[PDB]
């Protein structure tokens, strides 16, 4: 399935996206969903961020440069941080560059969406606790990272977590292309087969630290090619088997 959230003329709804149509879900969004009977043509509605997350956890970096780098000595341990859920925006809404930020970068990422309350999950049981996968952009004020040391402010501004366009529930994340474009120019391109810590390893690490709730999002890191976004840009992140998450950039 593809699951997401829409604003319709008749209000906001959690939906199955089929194609295209959006079919309103009644109950069991994290289980086997049932339907109310309401539906809309996808063209007639507006996609929102696809889930209500209690928190967004994110990995630093986490990509090998090349498939030949994957064999070597084991990677450094994961470095995680949190983005507040107030940073989340859906497709098409502007990333608002803060007046206090002078250098803001895009970071295209595969996003894990948790589907069950869980803690101390071994990597082998990660899939049974995952609803599915979507796309994220870990937007970051690099000047704030330099000033603060901690990355929380840099990554925590309202609008700094684009998420969408929908959550794919039957997707294998082992080897998907991920690419980021700014004004149609390719800035990042890699494959999720180059993740240093794979999805299972990430869920194992994060859930050993903190309880995860249904709807929580874990951003899995970003490849090289991270660079600036400025007023007037459009930045998009495309992941094989999911789609494209695109946002304009405004200052502000």
Domains of the chain: 1-50 (2.30.30.370), 51-252 (3.90.850.10)
d(CA 30, CA 138): 25
CA angle 121, 126, 127 (to 5 degrees): 150
CA angle 237, 239, 243 (to 5 degrees): 85
d(CA 140, CA 145): 8
d(CA 227, CA 236): 13
Q: Among residues 137, 99, 131, which one has the least CA distance to residue 117?
A: 131
Q: In the PDB record, what is the listed experimental method? A: X-ray
d(CA 12, CA 194): 37
**203 close to 89: Cβ distance less than 8 angstroms:** no
d(CA 208, CA 215): 18
Q: What is the resolution of this structure in A?
A: 1.6
């Amino acid at each position: 399935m593809r699951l997401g959230r829409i604003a319709s003329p008749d209000g906001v709804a959690f939906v199955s996206i089929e194609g295209a149509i959006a079919r309103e879900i009644a109950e069991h969004p994290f289980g086997t969903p049932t339907f109310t009977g309401r539906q809309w043509p996808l063209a007639d509605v507006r996609l929102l961020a696809p889930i209500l997350a209690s928190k967004v956890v994110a990995m630093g970096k986490n990509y090998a440069a090349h498939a030949a780098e994957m064999g070597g000595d084991p990677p450094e341990s994961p470095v995680i941080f949190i983005k507040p859920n107030t940073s989340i925006i859906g497709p098409g809404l502007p990333i608002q560059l803060p007046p206090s930020a002078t250098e803001v970068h895009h970071e295209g990422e595969l996003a894990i969406v948790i589907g069950r309350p869980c803690k101390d999950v071994p990597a082998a049981r990660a899939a049974e606790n995952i609803l599915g996968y979507t796309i994220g952009n870990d937007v970051s004020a690099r000047d704030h990272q330099r000033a603060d040391g901690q990355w929380t402010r840099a990554k925590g501004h309202d609008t700094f977590c684009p998420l969408g366009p929908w959550i794919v529930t039957d997707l294998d994340p082992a080897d998907l292309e991920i690419r980021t474009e700014v004004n149609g120019q390719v800035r990042q391109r890699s494959r999720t087969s180059l993740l240093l810590h794979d999805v299972g390893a990430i869920v194992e690490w994060v859930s050993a630290v903190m309880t995860l709730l249904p709807g929580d999002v874990i951003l899995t890191g970003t490849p090289e090619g991270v660079g600036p976004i400025v007023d007037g840009d459009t930045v998009s992140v495309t992941i094989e088997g999911i789609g494209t998450l695109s946002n304009p950039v405004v200052r502000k």
